[PDB]
Amino acid sequence: LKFVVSSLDIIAAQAGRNKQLAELAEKALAAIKENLPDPEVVFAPLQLATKSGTIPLTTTALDCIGKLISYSYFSAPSSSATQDGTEQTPLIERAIDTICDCFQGETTLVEIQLQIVKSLLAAVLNDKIIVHGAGLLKAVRQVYNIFLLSRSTANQQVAQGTLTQMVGTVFERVKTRLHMKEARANLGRLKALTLKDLEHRKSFDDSHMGDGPTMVSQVETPESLDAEDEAYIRDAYLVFRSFCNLSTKILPPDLRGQPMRSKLISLHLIHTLLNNHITVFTSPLCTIRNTKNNEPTNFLQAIKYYLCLSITRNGASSVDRVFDICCEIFWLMLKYMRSSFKNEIEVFLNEIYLALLARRNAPLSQKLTFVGILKRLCEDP
Amino acid sequence: VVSSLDIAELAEKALAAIKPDPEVVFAPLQLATKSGTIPLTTTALDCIGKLISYSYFSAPLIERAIDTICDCFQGETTLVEIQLQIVKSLLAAVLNDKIIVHGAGLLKAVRQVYNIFLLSRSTANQQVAQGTLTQMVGTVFERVKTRLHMKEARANKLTLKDLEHRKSFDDSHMGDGPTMVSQTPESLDAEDEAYIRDAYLVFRSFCNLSTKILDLRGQPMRSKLISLHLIHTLLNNHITVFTSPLCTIRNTKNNEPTNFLQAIKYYLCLSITRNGASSVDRVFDICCEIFWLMLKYMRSSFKNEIEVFLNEIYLALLARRNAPLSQKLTFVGILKRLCED
C-alpha cells in the first residue's frame, strides 16, 4: 500500500548519520514511482533500519515488515520443477529472522520488544496467509522468549497473551482440517511397569521433525490434501512437544523467577490446548508420520511420551499451583483417554497420587484436591 | 445339681453313687438329651453346660459333653426352647469364670451356634445366637491380647487370580487340634500358642465361609454377610493382635514360627478377592471397611495385594460408566478417610 511509502519517508528522514540507509530508502521510494517492485529493493532499507536498535527506525521498520509478510509480499523457496527463473527471491524466512533478531535479551528497548510481539503476531496469525515450519516455530519461540526475559511486566503480559493466541490458533487450524477430513470420509461412505520406566518408553520416532523449511499456504487431489494435513499437524505436534519439554525441568525451593514462570506457562498451555481441542488429540483420523519409516501414526500415541513425562515430573509437586495444573491435566487424561493411557494411569494413580494420600506429612489441601478430581470423575462419565 | 438328677436306670444309679466320679453323672445326663423333649433335654443340657462351666468335666471328656450338646440340634425342626438352651450352655461352656477350653472343643461349639443362627426360624434365636457368636470370637481374640501383653513384659505382573495360589503359610493338615483346658518357658510357650491356634482357626473358618461364589434373606447371602461382618469386627476390635511382631504361630511342617498376619494373609486376601466387586451393596460396603483396615494398618505387609485390589477392583469400578454411583462414592469416601486420618 502506502504505509510502505510513509515508512520509507520516516526511515529516510530519520536516517541521520547513516548515508547507506538514506540511499536504500530513497532508491526504494524512487523504484515505487512506476506504479510493488523487486521485494528486495523494498526489503533492504527495512532490514537495515531494524539493525540500528533505536526509535523510530527500528519500530517503523518492524511494523512495515510484519505487515508486508501478512500481505503475502514475501514468499518461501519452492521445489517446483516448473519455475522458469522469473520468480522473486524468496524472503519470508529472512523477514521473520529480521524481526526475531531485534530481541537480544532484557536490554532491548521496551518499545521495540512490544513492536516485535505485534509484528510476529501479524506475520503468523492473519487472514490471508498460513506460515508452516521453521518460520512459525521461530515466531512462537521468540514471543515466548520475550515473555520469559523481559523485565517489563507489561511486555511479559502481552507476550503471554499473544503466545496463548498463537498456540490456540495452531490447534484450531488442525481441528478444522480434521473436520474437513471426516466430512470427506462420511461423504465417501454415504455413496454406498513403574514411574521410572515411563521416561524410557518412546515408541514414536520424532528425530529431525523440528527440522525442515518454512512453507506458505494461501486461503484438489487426495495426495495434496494429505500433505497439507501433515503440514498443519506437524506444526501442532512441534508446539505441544516444545511445552512438555519446558515443563519437565526439576526445581528445588521462587515464583517470579524464570524457571518457575516457565514451568507454569508451559503447564497452563498444555492444559489449555488439551481442554479446548481434546478431539484433535483423540480422533483416530489425526495422524502424523514417523521419521524413521514414514509410516502414519496416531497423534495421541505420538505425543504420549511427552504428556506422561510432564505429569511424571510435575505431579506431586509441593507448589500448589503446579500441583493443581497437573491435577487438571490428569483429569483430562482420566476422562478422555482411559484406554490409550490405561497402564500409565495405573502408574500415576499408584506411585504419585495414592502415594500422596498415604503420606502422613503431606499437605491436606493437595489430598483434597486430588480426591475432588476422583469425585468429579464419579459424577461424570 | 442333685435336683437335676432327680428330675431311668442310670439316673438313679448316679443318685445311689452319691452316697463323685464324673462318668457316673455324665452317663444319665447324656442319655437324657437323646429324648428330644421338654423338660428332659432342656434340663439335661442345662446341667451339662453348668457342669462344664464348673470344672467337673475337664481337660477326652469336655469334648464328649459338647458333642452331646451339639447333637441336640437337628435343624430348624428342633424345638425353639432347646435351641436357645443349647446356645446358652455353649456360652457357659466357652465363657465362664474358671475354665478356657481350646482346640476342637472350642471349634465345635462356635461352628454349632453359627449353624443355629443360619438354620433357626426364630428371629429371637438367630439374634441371640449372633450376639453370643460375636462374644465368643471377640473373647478368643481378647485372650490372645492378654497373652501378648504378658509376653512383652516377660521379655522385657501380579494379578487378581494369582492371589488364589499364593499361600506361603502351610496349614494343610493343621487340623482342629486336641481339646485342652486352662484355668518354666516351655509350658508358657505351650499356653501362648494354645490361645493363638484357637484364634487362627476361628479367623480361617470365617474367611472360608466368606469365600463362596453365587436372595438377600436366603441362607447363602446371610452366611456371606455374617462371615464378612465378623471378619471386620475381629480386625477392627483386635488389630494389635494382627500387627504385633511377637504374635507367632508355628508352621505345621517344621514348627518354625511365622507372624500371625503373614499366616492369615491368604484367607483375608481370598475373602476380598471373592467379595470385593459384588453387585450387592451390603457386601460391597463391608468389604470396603475391611479394605480400609488393611489400608490403615497393613500398608507395609500388604503393599502388592493392596495395589492389586486398587487396580482390578476399585479403580476399575470408578472407570466403568455403567457402574453404580453409590459404590463409587462409598470407595471415594474411604479414600477421604485416608486424607483426614
XYZ file of C-alpha atoms in Angstrom:
722
model
C 0.000 0.000 0.000
C 1.186 3.443 1.111
C 2.141 2.558 4.675
C 5.177 1.247 2.761
C 5.762 4.781 1.454
C 5.148 6.532 4.791
C 7.524 4.040 6.408
C 10.234 4.743 3.834
C 9.730 8.531 4.251
C 10.224 8.225 8.016
C 13.196 5.917 7.532
C 14.883 8.253 5.021
C 14.177 11.303 7.202
C 15.417 9.774 10.456
C 18.408 8.026 8.820
C 20.793 10.621 10.255
C 24.477 9.753 10.101
C 23.682 6.592 8.139
C 24.098 7.521 4.457
C 23.652 3.979 3.163
C 20.237 3.795 4.888
C 19.026 7.051 3.390
C 20.215 5.877 -0.005
C 18.439 2.497 0.134
C 15.259 4.236 1.346
C 15.299 6.803 -1.459
C 16.189 4.095 -4.006
C 13.074 2.206 -2.850
C 10.863 5.328 -2.975
C 12.134 6.000 -6.482
C 11.518 2.413 -7.579
C 7.931 2.639 -6.337
C 7.198 5.697 -8.557
C 6.489 3.367 -11.564
C 3.115 2.158 -10.174
C 5.329 -3.043 -5.998
C 8.903 -3.634 -7.240
C 11.510 -6.297 -6.530
C 10.777 -7.383 -2.945
C 14.453 -6.956 -2.078
C 14.557 -3.290 -3.098
C 11.876 -2.521 -0.502
C 13.193 -5.036 1.996
C 16.775 -3.704 2.098
C 16.152 -0.393 3.882
C 13.618 -2.015 6.202
C 16.133 -4.677 7.266
C 18.974 -2.202 7.717
C 16.768 0.149 9.784
C 15.926 -2.714 12.186
C 19.662 -3.013 12.903
C 20.103 0.498 14.305
C 18.370 -0.502 17.524
C 16.835 2.944 18.031
C 13.390 4.562 17.857
C 11.733 5.157 15.479
C 13.938 3.455 12.859
C 13.562 0.016 14.357
C 9.869 0.165 15.333
C 8.722 1.590 11.984
C 10.793 -0.949 10.130
C 9.416 -3.863 12.196
C 5.808 -2.655 11.644
C 6.339 -2.460 7.911
C 7.985 -5.882 7.708
C 5.222 -7.659 9.656
C 2.513 -6.056 7.547
C 4.333 -6.944 4.330
C 4.604 -10.560 5.440
C 0.883 -10.572 6.234
C 0.004 -9.207 2.761
C 1.844 -12.173 1.258
C 4.507 -9.842 -0.249
C 7.317 -12.206 0.734
C 7.361 -15.916 -0.233
C 9.178 -19.195 0.611
C 11.595 -21.288 -1.506
C 9.906 -23.781 -3.864
C 10.818 -27.166 -5.197
C 8.511 -26.986 -8.185
C 10.226 -28.116 -11.378
C 8.060 -25.662 -13.406
C 9.814 -22.480 -12.252
C 11.388 -20.528 -15.181
C 13.662 -18.107 -13.320
C 11.303 -15.150 -13.307
C 10.163 -15.854 -9.768
C 11.048 -13.446 -6.962
C 13.814 -14.059 -4.428
C 12.109 -15.884 -1.530
C 12.407 -13.706 1.581
C 9.919 -14.811 4.249
C 12.310 -16.760 6.483
C 14.628 -13.801 6.265
C 11.904 -11.238 7.045
C 10.851 -13.264 10.146
C 14.516 -13.683 11.173
C 14.968 -9.927 10.881
C 12.072 -9.405 13.251
C 13.303 -12.061 15.699
C 16.869 -10.778 15.737
C 15.739 -7.455 17.197
C 15.218 -9.137 20.546
C 18.567 -9.534 22.196
C 17.667 -10.034 25.845
C 16.474 -7.764 28.635
C 18.403 -4.655 27.485
C 16.416 -4.300 24.241
C 14.206 -1.222 24.478
C 10.696 -1.972 25.786
C 9.010 -0.237 22.825
C 10.968 -2.463 20.457
C 10.098 -5.596 22.472
C 6.415 -4.738 22.126
C 6.720 -3.977 18.435
C 8.356 -7.388 17.969
C 5.429 -9.199 19.655
C 2.920 -7.323 17.449
C 4.927 -7.883 14.239
C 5.303 -11.611 14.830
C 1.575 -11.794 15.597
C 0.758 -10.023 12.332
C 3.193 -12.327 10.462
C 1.874 -15.584 11.874
C -1.831 -15.095 12.627
C -3.554 -13.300 9.799
C -6.427 -13.818 7.401
C -4.581 -14.256 4.118
C -1.516 -16.370 4.863
C -0.621 -19.527 6.710
C 3.039 -19.979 7.537
C 4.261 -23.508 8.340
C 7.595 -24.939 9.520
C 10.666 -23.168 10.888
C 9.340 -19.628 10.409
C 6.212 -20.304 12.506
C 8.022 -22.114 15.335
C 10.615 -19.282 15.417
C 7.927 -16.636 15.806
C 6.325 -18.637 18.590
C 9.653 -19.200 20.393
C 10.541 -15.511 20.110
C 7.253 -14.365 21.695
C 7.887 -16.935 24.482
C 11.463 -15.674 24.991
C 10.206 -12.105 25.349
C 7.626 -13.332 27.869
C 10.437 -15.001 29.830
C 13.273 -12.498 29.569
C 11.716 -9.020 29.590
C 11.872 -7.048 32.854
C 8.806 -5.134 31.798
C 5.693 -6.556 33.406
C 3.537 -5.089 30.619
C 5.530 -6.797 27.866
C 5.580 -10.063 29.845
C 1.794 -9.881 29.856
C 1.162 -9.011 26.215
C 3.664 -11.710 25.288
C 1.792 -14.269 27.385
C -1.492 -13.271 25.720
C -0.037 -13.412 22.205
C 1.673 -16.779 22.834
C -1.693 -18.174 24.041
C -3.458 -16.847 20.938
C -0.792 -18.398 18.669
C -0.774 -21.904 20.195
C -4.572 -21.759 20.304
C -4.635 -20.911 16.621
C -2.266 -23.714 15.566
C -4.579 -26.223 17.220
C -7.808 -24.594 15.921
C -6.471 -24.935 12.353
C -5.775 -28.629 12.977
C -9.354 -29.097 14.334
C -10.686 -27.533 11.090
C -8.572 -29.872 8.919
C -9.894 -32.953 10.782
C -13.476 -31.689 10.480
C -12.937 -31.498 6.675
C -11.296 -34.921 6.687
C -14.229 -36.595 8.484
C -16.727 -34.798 6.246
C -14.877 -36.398 3.289
C -14.871 -39.870 4.896
C -18.625 -39.548 5.626
C -19.407 -38.406 2.094
C -17.329 -41.340 0.922
C -19.396 -43.856 2.911
C -22.714 -42.286 2.016
C -22.226 -43.313 -1.578
C -22.754 -46.990 -0.713
C 5.528 -51.045 34.986
C 6.996 -48.189 37.064
C 7.384 -44.407 37.110
C 10.995 -44.741 36.042
C 10.018 -46.894 33.062
C 7.868 -44.105 31.634
C 10.958 -41.975 30.977
C 12.290 -44.680 28.641
C 9.147 -45.560 26.674
C 9.217 -43.669 23.399
C 7.584 -45.688 20.646
C 7.293 -42.848 18.131
C 10.485 -41.643 16.463
C 10.471 -37.865 16.000
C 14.146 -37.290 15.248
C 14.678 -34.240 12.984
C 10.990 -33.301 12.896
C 11.853 -29.809 14.151
C 13.942 -29.511 11.003
C 12.512 -28.549 7.659
C 11.786 -25.240 5.950
C 9.130 -22.578 6.124
C 6.185 -23.205 3.781
C 3.275 -20.855 2.975
C -0.376 -21.678 2.144
C -2.970 -19.208 0.809
C -6.631 -19.056 1.890
C -7.883 -30.821 -5.189
C -6.207 -34.268 -5.171
C -6.159 -36.525 -2.049
C -2.336 -36.705 -2.080
C -2.265 -32.932 -1.771
C -4.945 -32.884 0.992
C -2.907 -35.434 2.931
C 0.290 -33.362 2.566
C -1.433 -30.166 3.739
C -2.978 -32.035 6.665
C 0.558 -33.185 7.517
C 1.881 -29.618 7.498
C -0.828 -28.457 9.936
C -0.486 -31.461 12.232
C 3.277 -31.181 12.337
C 3.062 -27.544 13.472
C 0.768 -28.728 16.261
C 2.980 -31.622 17.392
C 6.135 -29.392 17.477
C 4.367 -26.722 19.583
C 2.935 -29.298 22.018
C 6.213 -31.243 22.374
C 8.017 -27.992 22.997
C 5.827 -27.130 26.018
C 6.000 -30.625 27.515
C 9.796 -30.357 27.316
C 9.837 -26.919 29.035
C 7.612 -28.362 31.784
C 9.988 -31.241 32.570
C 12.725 -29.266 34.429
C 13.385 -30.151 38.101
C 13.361 -27.324 40.695
C 14.444 -27.096 44.404
C 12.979 -24.499 46.828
C 10.683 -18.784 43.631
C 7.519 -17.515 41.921
C 8.826 -14.522 39.961
C 11.898 -16.407 38.788
C 12.266 -17.585 35.218
C 12.343 -21.299 35.975
C 9.022 -21.274 37.840
C 7.373 -18.910 35.373
C 8.476 -21.120 32.504
C 7.113 -24.291 34.229
C 3.801 -22.547 34.926
C 3.197 -21.126 31.411
C 4.144 -24.487 29.926
C 1.759 -26.445 32.156
C -1.009 -23.861 31.661
C -0.634 -24.018 27.859
C -0.555 -27.821 27.804
C -3.761 -27.878 29.896
C -5.494 -25.256 27.748
C -4.682 -26.987 24.449
C -5.928 -30.330 25.838
C -9.122 -28.784 27.258
C -10.053 -26.725 24.178
C -9.133 -29.254 21.448
C -9.393 -32.697 23.046
C -10.839 -34.039 19.762
C -7.615 -33.137 17.943
C -5.853 -35.498 20.357
C -8.437 -38.302 20.484
C -9.562 -38.544 16.834
C -8.399 -41.781 15.134
C -8.170 -39.749 11.904
C -5.468 -37.489 13.323
C -2.230 -38.893 12.005
C 1.436 -37.836 11.883
C 4.229 -39.635 10.016
C 7.065 -41.323 11.892
C 10.549 -40.104 10.869
C 12.293 -43.489 10.557
C 9.868 -45.361 8.306
C 7.453 -42.661 7.164
C 4.574 -44.825 8.496
C 1.488 -42.887 9.650
C 0.900 -42.959 13.432
C -1.940 -41.899 15.718
C -1.431 -38.398 17.167
C -2.221 -39.480 20.731
C 0.283 -42.320 20.515
C 2.843 -39.809 19.172
C 2.577 -37.251 21.980
C 2.076 -39.883 24.707
C 5.709 -39.924 25.833
C 5.821 -36.147 26.292
C 2.478 -35.921 28.098
C 3.339 -38.688 30.552
C 6.734 -37.086 31.031
C 5.168 -33.734 32.015
C 2.980 -35.471 34.601
C 5.837 -37.687 35.871
C 7.984 -34.661 36.593
C 5.315 -32.322 37.997
C 2.709 -34.471 39.717
C 3.467 -34.496 43.438
C 4.979 -31.013 43.296
C 4.932 -29.192 46.637
C 3.978 -25.933 44.918
C 0.178 -25.833 44.954
C -0.257 -24.068 41.599
C 1.872 -26.667 39.798
C 0.122 -29.490 41.663
C -3.271 -28.115 40.683
C -2.489 -27.770 36.964
C -1.220 -31.357 36.882
C -4.369 -32.491 38.653
C -6.420 -30.906 35.881
C -4.245 -32.445 33.088
C -4.598 -35.815 34.855
C -8.376 -35.264 34.963
C -8.468 -34.801 31.178
C -6.408 -37.935 30.689
C -8.643 -39.904 33.069
C -11.812 -38.766 31.347
C -10.970 -38.941 27.620
C -8.016 -41.394 27.362
C -8.681 -44.373 29.734
C -7.922 -46.956 27.025
C -4.853 -45.494 25.335
C -3.290 -44.489 28.650
C -4.598 -47.347 30.803
C -1.228 -48.548 32.090
C 0.169 -45.057 32.581
C -2.953 -44.037 34.502
C -2.378 -47.060 36.720
C 1.217 -45.975 37.423
C 0.279 -42.336 38.125
C -2.500 -43.473 40.484
C -0.223 -45.829 42.424
C 3.152 -44.051 42.543
C 2.049 -40.381 42.674
C -1.489 -39.730 43.874
C -2.450 -42.614 46.163
C 1.127 -42.476 47.378
C 0.492 -38.836 48.337
C -2.762 -39.737 50.115
C -0.957 -42.388 52.149
C 1.831 -39.939 53.089
C 1.444 -38.587 56.625
C 3.316 -35.280 56.359
C 1.665 -34.404 53.005
C -0.321 -31.160 52.601
C -4.052 -31.736 53.295
C -5.185 -29.288 50.605
C -3.424 -31.325 47.919
C -5.025 -34.545 49.125
C -8.450 -32.927 48.987
C -7.816 -31.527 45.502
C -6.954 -34.979 44.220
C -9.918 -36.605 45.944
C -12.099 -33.914 44.393
C -10.803 -34.994 40.985
C -11.942 -38.531 41.826
C -15.412 -37.326 42.834
C -15.681 -35.260 39.640
C -14.945 -38.485 37.762
C -17.662 -40.315 39.670
C -20.260 -37.711 38.771
C -19.362 -37.646 35.060
C -18.708 -40.367 32.619
C -27.333 -80.124 90.813
C -28.938 -83.059 92.637
C -32.342 -81.634 91.717
C -31.434 -82.052 88.048
C -30.672 -85.754 88.543
C -33.910 -86.256 90.469
C -35.885 -84.659 87.616
C -34.181 -94.164 84.061
C -31.835 -96.789 85.489
C -28.619 -94.719 85.104
C -30.314 -91.694 86.651
C -30.999 -93.420 89.977
C -27.679 -95.285 89.822
C -25.972 -91.848 89.898
C -28.009 -90.743 92.927
C -27.075 -94.032 94.617
C -23.389 -93.485 93.828
C -23.584 -90.071 95.545
C -23.943 -91.980 98.833
C -18.416 -88.170 92.937
C -16.857 -89.776 89.844
C -17.521 -87.843 86.553
C -18.578 -90.771 84.315
C -21.421 -91.942 86.581
C -23.023 -88.490 86.494
C -22.288 -87.950 82.792
C -23.957 -91.214 81.734
C -27.617 -90.411 82.583
C -27.322 -86.761 81.525
C -26.067 -87.747 78.084
C -28.788 -90.378 77.569
C -31.467 -87.924 78.723
C -30.545 -85.468 75.913
C -31.416 -88.033 73.242
C -35.080 -87.867 74.208
C -35.513 -84.596 72.335
C -38.279 -83.415 74.668
C -39.141 -80.848 77.360
C -38.185 -80.727 80.098
C -35.764 -83.671 79.754
C -33.429 -82.308 77.096
C -33.575 -78.738 78.407
C -32.757 -79.774 81.990
C -30.000 -82.198 80.946
C -28.348 -79.637 78.629
C -28.780 -77.031 81.339
C -26.999 -79.265 83.842
C -24.175 -80.356 81.475
C -23.470 -76.780 80.472
C -23.394 -75.778 84.132
C -21.000 -78.629 84.927
C -18.688 -77.577 82.096
C -18.992 -74.032 83.474
C -17.622 -75.659 86.610
C -14.531 -77.834 86.372
C -16.278 -81.180 86.952
C -15.861 -82.090 83.299
C -12.240 -81.355 82.443
C -9.018 -81.376 80.401
C -11.493 -86.509 76.211
C -14.413 -85.559 78.490
C -15.304 -81.917 77.719
C -15.427 -82.674 74.008
C -17.924 -85.531 74.540
C -20.131 -83.328 76.703
C -20.022 -80.623 73.995
C -20.639 -83.260 71.292
C -23.716 -84.364 73.234
C -24.912 -80.750 73.499
C -24.332 -80.026 69.802
C -26.138 -83.241 68.802
C -29.378 -81.885 70.267
C -29.652 -79.655 67.194
C -31.032 -81.446 64.131
C -32.019 -78.392 62.103
C -34.937 -75.950 62.310
C -37.486 -78.589 63.351
C -35.690 -78.696 66.691
C -37.870 -77.117 69.405
C -37.084 -73.403 69.953
C -36.566 -73.688 73.720
C -33.989 -76.398 73.112
C -32.186 -74.199 70.542
C -31.946 -71.322 72.990
C -30.805 -73.611 75.824
C -28.068 -75.046 73.562
C -26.845 -71.563 72.744
C -26.726 -70.655 76.462
C -24.999 -73.844 77.552
C -22.359 -73.428 74.843
C -21.891 -69.829 76.028
C -21.483 -71.031 79.615
C -19.021 -73.640 78.375
C -16.824 -71.190 76.482
C -17.334 -68.084 78.631
C -17.064 -68.851 82.341
C -15.051 -67.668 85.330
C -12.725 -70.623 85.755
C -12.100 -72.558 82.537
C -10.941 -71.929 78.975
C -11.390 -74.827 76.541
C -9.114 -74.942 73.481
C -8.975 -76.815 70.188
C -11.727 -78.951 68.693
C -13.978 -78.425 71.711
C -13.973 -74.668 71.196
C -14.207 -75.027 67.460
C -17.171 -77.423 67.702
C -19.190 -75.056 69.894
C -18.589 -71.951 67.728
C -19.474 -73.782 64.484
C -22.655 -75.038 66.115
C -24.032 -71.716 67.321
C -23.205 -70.292 63.908
C -25.212 -73.088 62.334
C -28.160 -72.434 64.653
C -28.062 -68.798 63.554
C -28.042 -69.934 59.946
C -30.831 -72.516 60.241
C -33.212 -71.367 63.010
C -36.622 -69.913 62.169
C -36.876 -67.877 65.355
C -35.808 -64.273 64.869
C -35.094 -64.172 68.603
C -32.983 -67.343 68.472
C -30.947 -66.303 65.429
C -30.302 -62.897 67.017
C -29.196 -64.194 70.438
C -27.093 -66.746 68.558
C -25.460 -63.887 66.624
C -24.716 -61.951 69.821
C -23.208 -64.970 71.580
C -21.153 -65.871 68.500
C -19.710 -62.346 68.361
C -18.972 -62.501 72.087
C -17.178 -65.851 71.681
C -14.819 -64.869 68.871
C -14.213 -61.475 70.491
C -13.318 -63.223 73.741
C -10.864 -65.594 71.993
C -9.006 -62.661 70.478
C -9.146 -60.725 73.767
C -7.418 -63.693 75.449
C -4.674 -63.523 72.829
C -4.268 -59.761 73.512
C -3.721 -60.563 77.192
C -1.138 -63.272 76.403
C 0.853 -60.877 74.164
C 0.618 -58.242 76.895
C 2.195 -60.671 79.386
C 4.789 -61.708 76.806
C 6.355 -58.287 76.155
C 6.669 -57.862 79.946
C 8.340 -61.254 80.405
C 10.721 -60.486 77.526
C 11.432 -57.036 78.999
C 2.794 -58.622 36.901
C 0.722 -59.590 39.969
C -2.986 -60.075 39.240
C -6.291 -60.813 40.972
C -6.192 -64.538 40.143
C -2.608 -65.191 41.297
C -3.761 -64.277 44.823
C -5.683 -67.536 44.869
C -2.445 -69.516 44.511
C -0.173 -67.581 46.867
C -0.171 -69.391 50.176
C 3.170 -69.023 51.934
C 1.963 -70.390 55.256
C 1.015 -74.044 55.014
C -1.861 -75.190 57.193
C -2.693 -78.331 55.211
C -3.499 -80.978 57.832
C -3.155 -78.421 60.629
C -6.468 -79.818 61.841
C -8.804 -78.657 64.594
C -6.335 -79.586 67.303
C -6.742 -81.527 70.504
C -9.040 -80.350 73.304
C -7.157 -78.622 76.153
C -8.080 -76.670 79.290
C -6.661 -73.596 81.059
C -7.745 -72.282 84.490
C 9.356 -72.704 83.030
C 9.265 -71.194 79.453
C 8.163 -74.414 77.719
C 4.791 -74.563 79.499
C 4.358 -70.853 78.802
C 5.066 -71.359 75.107
C 2.610 -74.245 75.010
C -0.019 -71.906 76.579
C 0.535 -68.745 74.465
C 0.484 -70.963 71.462
C -2.697 -72.652 72.760
C -4.531 -69.293 72.555
C -3.009 -68.419 69.196
C -4.077 -71.669 67.418
C -7.597 -71.044 68.693
C -7.641 -67.549 67.138
C -6.147 -68.677 63.809
C -8.702 -71.472 63.416
C -11.624 -69.095 64.050
C -10.421 -66.479 61.586
C -9.688 -69.077 58.885
C -13.123 -70.632 59.359
C -14.825 -67.291 58.724
C -12.758 -66.335 55.675
C -13.555 -69.756 54.252
C -17.277 -69.269 54.863
C -16.995 -65.885 53.131
C -15.315 -67.441 50.071
C -18.421 -68.961 48.348
C -19.434 -67.928 44.774
C -23.088 -67.208 43.913
C -31.927 -63.978 47.616
C -30.924 -61.339 50.187
C -32.691 -63.174 53.021
C -31.663 -66.630 51.809
C -29.053 -68.763 53.563
C -26.076 -68.178 51.245
C -26.225 -64.379 51.479
C -26.790 -64.322 55.247
C -23.862 -66.687 55.646
C -21.669 -64.415 53.489
C -22.770 -61.278 55.320
C -22.282 -62.630 58.835
C -18.830 -64.000 57.929
C -17.787 -60.649 56.472
C -19.241 -58.787 59.481
C -17.351 -60.970 61.953
C -14.098 -60.744 59.983
C -14.448 -56.974 60.006
C -15.286 -56.960 63.736
C -12.188 -59.033 64.588
C -9.880 -56.791 62.532
C -11.419 -53.601 63.928
C -11.560 -54.620 67.625
C -8.307 -56.588 67.991
C -5.939 -55.215 65.343
C -2.942 -55.136 67.716
C -3.086 -58.921 67.780
C -2.710 -58.977 63.992
C 0.052 -56.364 63.861
C 2.151 -57.487 66.848
C 5.512 -58.792 65.524
C 5.799 -61.122 68.509
C 2.480 -62.834 67.845
C 3.679 -66.014 66.169
C 2.188 -69.333 65.123
C 4.168 -72.458 64.343
C 4.008 -73.870 60.833
C 2.523 -77.359 60.510
C 5.523 -78.644 58.518
C 8.526 -77.712 60.650
C 7.123 -75.872 63.674
C 9.065 -72.761 62.607
C 7.450 -69.542 63.924
C 5.624 -67.334 61.426
C 3.993 -63.957 62.085
C 0.199 -64.159 62.580
C -0.576 -61.526 59.946
C 1.538 -63.342 57.386
C -0.333 -66.523 58.301
C -3.856 -65.183 57.695
C -2.805 -63.177 54.618
C -4.023 -65.795 52.119
C -7.506 -66.054 53.631
C -8.059 -62.330 54.110
C -6.996 -61.686 50.525
C -9.201 -64.504 49.286
C -12.186 -63.003 51.079
C -11.570 -59.597 49.472
C -10.900 -61.111 46.014
C -14.148 -63.069 46.052
C -16.360 -60.405 47.539
C -14.764 -57.177 46.515
C -16.674 -56.411 43.383
C -20.036 -57.748 44.366
C -23.037 -56.062 42.820
C -24.834 -56.195 46.170
C -24.151 -53.018 48.166
C -24.064 -54.567 51.676
C -21.297 -56.969 50.709
C -19.531 -54.201 48.815
C -19.634 -51.844 51.820
C -18.412 -54.410 54.378
C -15.581 -55.418 52.056
C -14.772 -51.739 51.738
C -14.488 -51.468 55.536
C -12.153 -54.468 55.669
C -10.106 -52.963 52.837
C -9.927 -49.739 54.817
C -8.480 -51.525 57.831
C -5.982 -53.270 55.553
C -5.035 -49.845 54.146
C -4.585 -48.136 57.506
C -2.767 -50.893 59.467
C -1.144 -53.183 56.895
C 0.289 -50.860 54.246
C 3.766 -52.391 54.573
C 2.766 -56.030 54.932
C 0.135 -55.965 52.172
C 1.543 -53.461 49.645
C 1.337 -55.592 46.480
C -2.104 -57.063 47.280
C -3.462 -53.597 48.085
C -2.105 -52.438 44.732
C -3.830 -55.367 43.011
C -7.154 -54.597 44.734
C -6.941 -50.919 43.821
C -6.225 -51.606 40.168
C -8.521 -54.581 39.495
C -11.494 -53.803 41.757
C -11.987 -50.222 42.954
C -10.353 -48.024 40.305
C -11.829 -50.421 37.740
C -15.215 -49.600 39.232
C -14.517 -45.871 39.090
C -13.649 -46.138 35.405
C -16.828 -48.004 34.371
C -19.575 -45.637 33.181
C -22.470 -48.055 33.738
C -21.277 -48.771 37.288
C -23.474 -47.833 40.309
C -22.759 -44.312 41.631
C -23.358 -45.409 45.235
C -20.423 -47.851 45.190
C -18.074 -45.307 43.619
C -18.998 -42.745 46.258
C -18.512 -45.310 49.081
C -14.973 -46.002 47.808
C -14.078 -42.348 47.347
C -15.266 -41.766 50.930
C -12.825 -44.475 52.084
C -10.013 -42.625 50.334
C -11.082 -39.365 52.002
C -10.778 -41.121 55.414
C -7.250 -41.732 54.277
C -6.846 -37.983 53.765
C -8.053 -36.830 57.175
C -6.562 -39.639 59.287
